[PDB]
Amino acid sequence: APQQINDIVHRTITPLIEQQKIPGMAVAVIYQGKPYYFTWGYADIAKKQPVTQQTLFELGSVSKTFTGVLGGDAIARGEIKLSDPTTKYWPELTAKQWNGITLLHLATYTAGGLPLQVPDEVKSSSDLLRFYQNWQPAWAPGTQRLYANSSIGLFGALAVKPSGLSFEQAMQTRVFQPLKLNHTWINVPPAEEKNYAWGYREGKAVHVSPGALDAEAGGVKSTIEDMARWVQSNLKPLDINEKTLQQGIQLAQSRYWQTGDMYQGLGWEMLDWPVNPDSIINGSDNKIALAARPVKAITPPTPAVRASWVHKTGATGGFGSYVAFIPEKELGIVMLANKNYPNPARVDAAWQILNALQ
């Protein structure tokens, strides 16, 4: 791995692992259409299994990027429009508050205060309906961003209705397979369990226990290799064979809303390049990325801006992920760890590395 990459990667990631006390970590640096991989520590501490390029990590909310891109491809197929009312794909949703709530709203956390989580109480088809019927908006549509799984998760479930496929099936056949993401899963099959890292919360081995719409909101598990390929795909969408998937990626990186220096895409979030690390570093915490924020509509949305920092953070109980890339430099990074550690740290480290390579 070229002197410039090797130097900066090892200088940056080692101290992080030590200070955050991460049991196992994998990293990919994408540099001019080539991935370079790095691994440290353990996927399973008790059985002394190392991290490899075949270790599966829980992506958590980095899964929203796949959801955003699958929705994007549904639009490009002319199956859905972001401008369509939610009501058109869930007619039972009759309550008056849903009238001007569009698929765009759902996809971008701007429906008017949909809650962060679907209640654990929700278990059936009709349970979930009651939940969305009885939800009471704090705000009119398209005025405030509140980060929410109940919002983009519903977008996920609806965006695949006209196909007739289940969400997992649509994701597998329209996104995973065409991009050769052969070790990326919503449900990990028994054959891959040996590669499935344990996450660590308070020194305890844990795996995520999905409730309603977690598949759509945070249920993807992937390897460092498939994640680099996913980053490559997002960096250069026009090199992609399947026409709608190519469009779908581009649509996921369009800028629909602005809040501060941040622009909301489908799943992805973007800033203008070059950026102030401090602008990103303090745009993620338990009270920053999970805050109510007024948005300005971008009228009409800017299509994918090559001069951007495109990124997403994600976590589960036992895991912590980060992905970032800059299309104009053919550069990006993925960071997968089996401990949920502080977002600012993740961004700090990603920043150090890509800045020096660019």
Which H helix or E strand runs over 76?
helix 63-76
Is 61 flagged in the annotation as binding? yes
Is 147 flagged in the annotation as binding? yes
Q: How many CB atoms lie within 10 A of CB 268?
A: 25
What amino acid occupies position 248? G
Evaluated on CA atoms 75, 186, 134, 289, the torsion sign reads: negative
- 353: which 2 tokens? 């590395």
Cβ–Cβ under 8 Å, residues 76 and 176: no
Catalytic residue, candidates 61, 151, 233, 321: 61
What is the spatial distance between Cα 280 and Cα 11, in angstroms, rounded to a whole number? 21
Cβ–Cβ under 8 Å, residues 321 and 335: yes
Burial bucket for residue 150 (CB in 10 Å: 0-12, 13-18, 19+): buried
Rounded to 5 degrees, what angle do the CA atoms 278, 280, 281 make? 60
What is the spatial distance between Cα 107 and Cα 76, in angstroms, rounded to a whole number? 16
| The residue to which tokens 């629909």 are assigned | 256
What amino acid occupies position 46? A
- 229: which 2 tokens? 């390929």
Angstrom distances, CA of residue 229 to CA of 88, 147, 178, 332, 352:
35, 27, 12, 11, 22
Is 258 flagged in the annotation as binding? no
Domains in the chain, please, with CATH?
1-358 (3.40.710.10)
Cβ–Cβ under 8 Å, residues 75 and 248: yes
Return the beta strands (E) in 152-192 as ranges: none
Distant-in-sequence, close-in-space partners of 137: CB < 8 Å, separation ≥ 6: 97, 111, 112, 113
If you count DSSP H runs as helices and E runs as strands, how many of each does the chain have, helices first? Answer: 11, 16
What is the spatial distance between Cα 34 and Cα 178, in angstroms, rounded to a whole number? 19
What amino acid occupies position 9? V
Is 172 flagged in the annotation as binding? no
Evaluated on CA atoms 199, 36, 71, 293, the torsion sign reads: positive
Which phi and psi angles does 281 have, rounded to 5°? Answer: -50, -40
Q: DSSP character for 85?
A: B
Evaluated on CA atoms 153, 159, 164, 165, the torsion sign reads: negative
Distant-in-sequence, close-in-space partners of 295: CB < 8 Å, separation ≥ 6: 110, 142, 143, 144, 145, 257, 258, 259, 264
Task: Report residue 139 CA to chain centroid gap.
Answer: 25
What is the spatial distance between Cα 132 and Cα 118, in angstroms, rounded to a whole number? 10
284 is an active site residue: no
Distant-in-sequence, close-in-space partners of 69: CB < 8 Å, separation ≥ 6: 175, 234, 245, 248, 249, 252, 266, 267
Which phi and psi angles does 183 have, rounded to 5°? Answer: -125, 40
Distant-in-sequence, close-in-space partners of 99: CB < 8 Å, separation ≥ 6: 85, 87
Provide the terminal-to-terminal Cα distance of the chain, rounded to the nearest Å: 16
Q: DSSP character for 304?
A: P
Is 343 flagged in the annotation as binding? no
| The residue to which tokens 């104009």 are assigned | 328
Peptide bond into 119 cis (omega under 30): no
- 119: which 2 tokens? 């209640």
DSSP-assigned letters across all residues of 277-290: HHHHHTSSSTTTTT
Cβ–Cβ under 8 Å, residues 284 and 347: yes
What is the spatial distance between Cα 90 and Cα 74, in angstroms, rounded to a whole number? 16
Partners of 297 in the β-ladder: 257
Is 117 flagged in the annotation as binding? yes
Q: Of 190, 301, 178, which is closest to residue 229 (Cα–Cα)?
A: 178
Cβ–Cβ under 8 Å, residues 128 and 92: no
What is the spatial distance between Cα 83 and Cα 105, in angstroms, rounded to a whole number? 9
Q: How many CB atoms lie within 10 A of CB 21?
A: 10
